[PDB]
Design a protein around this ligand. Sequence first.
Ligand SMILES: [Zn+2]
Length: 381
Amino acid sequence: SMQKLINSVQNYAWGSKTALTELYGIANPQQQPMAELWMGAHPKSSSRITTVSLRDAIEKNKTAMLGEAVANRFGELPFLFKVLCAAQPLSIQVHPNKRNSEIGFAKENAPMDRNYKDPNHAPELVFALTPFLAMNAFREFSDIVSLLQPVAGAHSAIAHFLQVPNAERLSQLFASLLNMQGEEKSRALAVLKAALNSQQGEPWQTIRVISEYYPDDSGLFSPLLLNVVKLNPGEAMFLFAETPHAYLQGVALEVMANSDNVLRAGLTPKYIDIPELVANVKFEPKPAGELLTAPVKSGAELDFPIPVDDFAFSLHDLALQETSIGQHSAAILFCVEGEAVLRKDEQRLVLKPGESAFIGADESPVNASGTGRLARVYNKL
Ligand SMILES: [Zn+2]
């Protein structure tokens, strides 16, 4: 009924050597970086159940596993669920919208794995498991101005912006910063990196955190353009389309639609097509108090509303008295802390922290009890 998941760990060079072990007791005796723990049915690394591919168990029976609304809307598990362990800051990224991902995939086809690997859009939610430092969206024009003034002599475009703090200038400035070359770029970093020494607090400290991993990158300027946030454990943010963001430090749950598309906007050595980037970015400020997702608590369930149909995400507080958890779709249940006893009829499945279970549509509901919390990814249709 309930299938305990065997999950892939991506050992990207940027991953923590200790965070998955320290939190969840996941073994790592050769000390590889452990960057992402994948829960789902990705074609390149499907989670498995007891052994067989979860992705294969789904395609063998879509209706029973996904439920009819999901199988008729998506035709597969419509999300991928990760624990992300960033021991280094990652690249700034923008997800183009649906329309433009279609255009992009199609246009590239006339080279391959390319930024449009895939004609799908890529909504994302991140959920902090440990203090999680990030960038999300442009700051308010007035705060952009205040933060740039200590470095205004850095580059002509900054001066141009400060003189007229509008969306065009921000856009020009964004583009101008990424297209700095040679000594144009050095005059710029020097104004910035020398001026890290006579400024205090944030966002300067964040810049200083990034400069360890990216000394020679124009994205060192981004924390002046973009809202820096430290998510506390249990807070979350949705990453909209056309909105620069980056995951800089810490451990989180990440849910995403199935798209591998991404336009990089800095903190990266790879080539960046700035025209392509700039056409797919929304140069509107976004206030600090709209960044986090406001959850809704009902009973023991804390739901985080997602403005997109592709997935939904809820936290469930376990009590020693059983509670019912059900959905009209497939769900993945992931133990965040404590310990969860799952029961369906005669079946009992214990989840320790970091362990997950796949619950097919035809196996809802299940009874959960124990201590701590369980995260669930599912679909509300
Ligand atoms: Zn993203």
